[PDB]
């Protein structure tokens, strides 16, 4: 009968970066989804495999909330079948994804006038990520035809780059907070239900 802690997810003070996105398991609660879609704060509310209006009528199990911060034009890369830096090396959604991608502008929280640098994205990986795979591993990688045996070769590229968030940046470069809700459709005795 108790409420699901969406306020600890959407209204959190700090979000982790997209390379180290935060995953929260939501279970044994009643989820009131009607305060999400009718809120005018979210610019992007795109649900795959479920309509957002019917979210109150279905009982799920093992609901996952994935929270991170990406810039403005990369919100389209949080979708099944997309390519880019975020989809390949930072956060990959499966082709059979069911759930909802919610994203809203957070320039007045996540931008500082000198430049906010608390948010990182991985620039390169040897292979694309598997879906729902987290790469917090920061490893020095090479450049080509010379090994990284110290300084001596071509100098060694770093995988994680920080976003340059200033509030004077135009929209599209501005911080957008992304929460991805992921469900499973009625395979076990369900724990997460609507009213």
């Amino acid at each position: 009968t108790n409420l699901c802690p969406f306020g600890e997810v959407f209204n959190a003070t700090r979000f982790a970066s997209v390379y180290a996105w935060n995953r929260k398991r939501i279970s044994n609660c009643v989820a009131d989804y009607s305060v999400l879609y009718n809120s005018a704060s979210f610019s992007t509310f795109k649900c795959y495999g479920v309509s957002p209006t019917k979210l109150n009528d279905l009982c799920f199990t093992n609901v996952y909330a994935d929270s991170f911060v990406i810039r403005g034009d990369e919100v389209r890369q949080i979708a099944p079948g997309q390519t880019g830096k975020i989809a390949d090396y930072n956060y990959k959604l499966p082709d059979d994804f069911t759930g909802c991608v919610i994203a809203w502008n957070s320039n007045n929280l996540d931008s500082k006038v000198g430049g906010n640098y608390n948010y990182l994205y991985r620039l390169f990986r040897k292979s694309n990520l598997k879906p729902f795979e987290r790469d917090i591993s920061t490893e020095i990688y090479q450049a080509g035809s010379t090994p990284c045996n110290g300084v001596e070769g071509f100098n060694c590229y770093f995988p994680l780059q920080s976003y340059g968030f200033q509030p004077t940046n135009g929209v599209g470069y501005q911080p957008y907070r992304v929460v991805v809700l992921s469900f499973e459709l009625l395979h076990a005795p369900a724990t997460v239900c609507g009213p």
Partner: nanobody
């Protein structure tokens, strides 16, 4: 010209602190992000920490609370505080510099400092 110089290495007791300094000369220290790297003899390079103009410090998840990266921008310097030294931290340390407006190429490197720990 562009130059990174380091200081602070030596032979010290384990558990005693160290303060390694990386002075930058010839370029403005802003708009570049600074890295600390170490390598052990017989081992490859291991990245330690990043710090930006904001003061955002990012550490290696492998080693926790042993180091503390401290940037200073009045005199274009970078400090590393190392606390509670273990025997395996015998390493050559390097100061690295990336441009924030390109790929993560580390451009020029420090020549390095030698840290030898023993009892």
């Amino acid at each position: 010209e562009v130059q990174l110089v380091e200081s602070g290495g030596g032979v010290v007791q384990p558990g005693r602190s160290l303060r390694l300094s990386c002075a930058a000369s010839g370029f403005t220290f802003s708009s570049y992000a600074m890295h600390w790297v170490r390598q052990a003899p017989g081992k490859g390079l291991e990245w330690i920490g990043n710090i930006y103009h904001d003061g955002s410090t990012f550490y290696n998840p492998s080693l926790k609370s042993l180091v503390t990266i401290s940037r200073d921008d009045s005199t274009n310097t970078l400090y590393l505080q190392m606390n509670s030294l273990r025997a395996e931290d015998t390493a050559i340390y390097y100061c690295a510099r990336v441009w924030l407006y390109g790929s993560g190429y580390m451009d020029v490197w420090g020549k390095g400092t030698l840290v030898t720990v023993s009892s």
